[PDB]
């Protein structure tokens, strides 16, 4: 009633996937340090392969409320306890890119574009769409591969198996009591 219901609707949803990507990384990080022995190339792909999967769900969880969250755009106001020790606040509320943004430029400049505007750009879009349509051609060729199939029970059993000469248990029953083996 004093202060407000600010934001964070799907924030819980981000936190959960934020954590799982943290949790899978953290554990790989802990092992990463026992470089005394690497865990079994199976083991690391199990942890680093679902650890990458974790970031797909964490990647997507971001877009799903993606309209909502960049719109929310909360900047912090708090206890002045946050003001002492300072930086933690600069650090903890800061968005940037690392040395990262740079190979992002290497990549952007690696494309064939940059300052030539709208009309020529719309055209490139239609052209890339044509590439995706030529990719449908993959659908046609996949039909050719033509490999899809399956692995009456009675119909299949005659072909497969006639196994068993008798009842093991009953045979034994006889040997011990003289009770005789009845049809199985």
């Amino acid at each position: 009633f004093d202060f407000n219901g600010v934001p964070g609707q799907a924030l819980d949803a981000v936190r959960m996937r934020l954590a799982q990507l943290t949790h899978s990384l953290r554990r790989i990080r802990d092992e990463m340090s026992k470089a005394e022995l690497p865990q079994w190339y199976t083991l690391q792909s199990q942890l680093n392969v679902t650890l990458s999967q974790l970031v797909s769900v964490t990647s997507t969880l971001q877009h799903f409320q993606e309209t909502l969250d960049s719109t929310v755009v909360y900047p912090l106001p708090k206890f002045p306890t946050t003001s002492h020790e300072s930086l933690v606040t600069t650090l903890l509320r800061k968005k940037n890119i690392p040395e990262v943004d740079e190979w992002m430029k290497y990549v952007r400049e690696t494309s064939g574009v940059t300052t030539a505007l709208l009309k020529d750009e719309e055209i490139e879009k239609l052209l890339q769409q044509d590439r995706e349509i030529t990719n449908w051609a993959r659908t046609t060729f996949r039909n050719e591969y033509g490999k899809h199939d399956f692995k009456h029970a009675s119909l299949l059993v005659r072909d497969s198996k006639p196994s068993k000469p008798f009842n093991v248990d009953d045979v034994l029953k006889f040997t011990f009591t003289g009770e005789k083996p009845i049809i199985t």
Binding site: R15, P38, P77, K78, L92, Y106, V113
Partner: protein, 492 residues
């Protein structure tokens, strides 16, 4: 192919600094993303507003000490519009084609080094072809793994020697292919040298010291086993390697002569210093065969051809002594095939052991010299006109050779039969003998028994007449005396 793909899937490497620095790269470059996923865990405290929010918050120890629920937002659904609708946003989607393009450039590059990585695996396809060629049919497909670990590491397959029946220690074979398209024969000890490195054949050697009883001059003569010193076992040829495998079998056989060495230890005939043992026997002083408690036959000598009478005999020894422990190698397997426990642990009472080299020594020496000596004592009965004869008769009475009777089974019966005819050789106690008279008729008889080169002479005698009189007695001193007493109670 699978083993080699599994090798590449073992992380395995022997790199100094090269291997070292690389793994440090993993540590730091992975750690960075681990640590930045922790900023992700800090957005968790950023919720606040709820108890479950506090739970998420404690994620930082600094949150444990930064109490506040701190932050708040408003509405710029308009700014969401700007993010989506900007000409900048249309353009940014170009950063999507751009990074994706360079990712496809990476992808292309990775894909090509892959087919060339399958090309080093074609070296292996060739190795399997090499294995397909050459040693085939009956032969070991032993599959092994070494360098420990127990999973992955280094794993491969091959055959070895001993099999049915048990010498016991250090016995097998292990085989791999070099880049010269030749197979190297490992042994899991017997240390690798393509079709061996250095080989010891069993060897033999028999000396006689006579001089017509002159100056105590001894010479030897040795039955020699040398197929050649020149070695072929051609590279790229497992057929030549099959020959090398047969050589391997011979090397395993010498290990058997080590068991015979041990079986010597039960006798009083030469074992000197515990460092060398020499096989030798008293009469005409002679020596027969050798191989040091260190070993058997190790190759390095000049080669000239002259033979000698001793030498011819000596080749007969080796085959016997060798043969005799195929017997052991056989009566071992009798028991094994036949009854539950298995045979393991070799020659208790040095009864089983002793057979090798023990009964050959005995045989030669004992029965023979003693029979000769008995014959001089029977020259003490050389006095009467008389007559007296020797048979295999003791031999005939026990230990029959290759009999139709068999044992418990058809399968069992065969092996029993195999034992029996060879069993004459192993059994070789002295047969024994007799002498007789007619005219109101008397009769006597004696048996020479070797028990392990010790000689008993047990005799009998009956003087058959209208009313019967008889005696039987079972030491050579007394035998001389018994013969003297017999002269008196004979005719004379």
């Amino acid at each position: 192919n699978e083993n080699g793909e599994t090798d590449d899937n073992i992380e395995t490497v022997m790199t100094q600094e090269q291997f070292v620095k690389r793994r440090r790269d993993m540590l730091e470059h992975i750690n960075l993303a681990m640590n930045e996923s922790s900023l992700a865990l800090e957005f968790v405290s950023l919720l606040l507003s709820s108890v479950k929010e506090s739970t998420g918050m404690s994620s930082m120890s600094p949150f444990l000490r930064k109490v506040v629920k701190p932050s708040s937002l408003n509405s710029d659904k308009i700014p969401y519009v700007a993010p989506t609708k900007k000409e900048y946003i249309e353009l940014d989607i170009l950063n999507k084609g751009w990074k994706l393009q360079s990712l496809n450039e990476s992808k292309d590059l990775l894909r090509a080094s892959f087919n060339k990585l399958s090309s080093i695996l074609q070296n292996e396809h060739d190795y399997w072809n090499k294995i397909m060629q050459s040693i085939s049919n009956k032969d070991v497909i032993f599959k092994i793994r070494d360098r420990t670990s127990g999973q992955k590491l280094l794993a491969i397959k091959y055959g070895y020697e001993d099999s049915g029946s048990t010498y016991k220690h250090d016995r097998g074979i292990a085989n791999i292919r070099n880049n010269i398209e030749s197979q190297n024969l490992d042994l899991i000890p017997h240390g690798t040298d393509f079709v061996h490195s250095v080989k010891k054949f069993l060897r033999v050697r028999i000396f006689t010291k006579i001089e017509s009883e002159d100056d105590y001059i001894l010479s030897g003569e040795s039955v020699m086993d040398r197929d050649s010193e020149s070695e072929e076992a051609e590279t790229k040829d497992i057929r030549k390697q099959i020959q090398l495998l047969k050589k391997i079998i011979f090397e395993k056989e010498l290990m058997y002569q080590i068991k015979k060495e041990c079986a010597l230890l039960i006798s009083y005939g030469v074992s000197i210093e515990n460092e060398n043992k020499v096989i030798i026997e008293l009469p005409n002083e002679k020596f027969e065969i050798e191989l040091l408690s260190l070993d058997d036959d190790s190759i390095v000598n000049h080669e000239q051809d002259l033979p000698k009478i001793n030498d011819k005999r000596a080749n007969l020894m080796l085959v016997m002594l060798r043969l005799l422990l195929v017997v052991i190698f056989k009566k071992t397997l009798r028991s094994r095939i036949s009854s539950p426990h298995g045979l393991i642990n070799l020659n208790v009472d040095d009864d089983i052991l002793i057979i090798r080299p023990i009964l050959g020594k005995v045989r030669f020496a004992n029965y023979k010299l003693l029979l000769k000596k008995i014959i001089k004592d029977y020259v003490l009965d050389i006095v009467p006109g008389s007559s007296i004869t020797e048979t295999e008769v003791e031999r005939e009475q026990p230990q029959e050779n290759k009999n139709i009777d068999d044992e418990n089974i058809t399968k069992l019966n065969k092996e029993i039969r195999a034992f029996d005819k060879l069993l004459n050789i192993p059994r070789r106690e002295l047969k024994i003998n007799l002498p007789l008279t007619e005219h109101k008729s008397p009769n006597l008889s004696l048996m020479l028994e070797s028990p392990n080169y010790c000689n008993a002479l047990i005799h009998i005698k009956f003087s058959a007449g209208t009313e019967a009189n008889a005696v039987s007695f079972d030491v050579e001193d007394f035998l001389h005396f018994i013969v003297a007493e017999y002269i008196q109670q004979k005719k004379v």
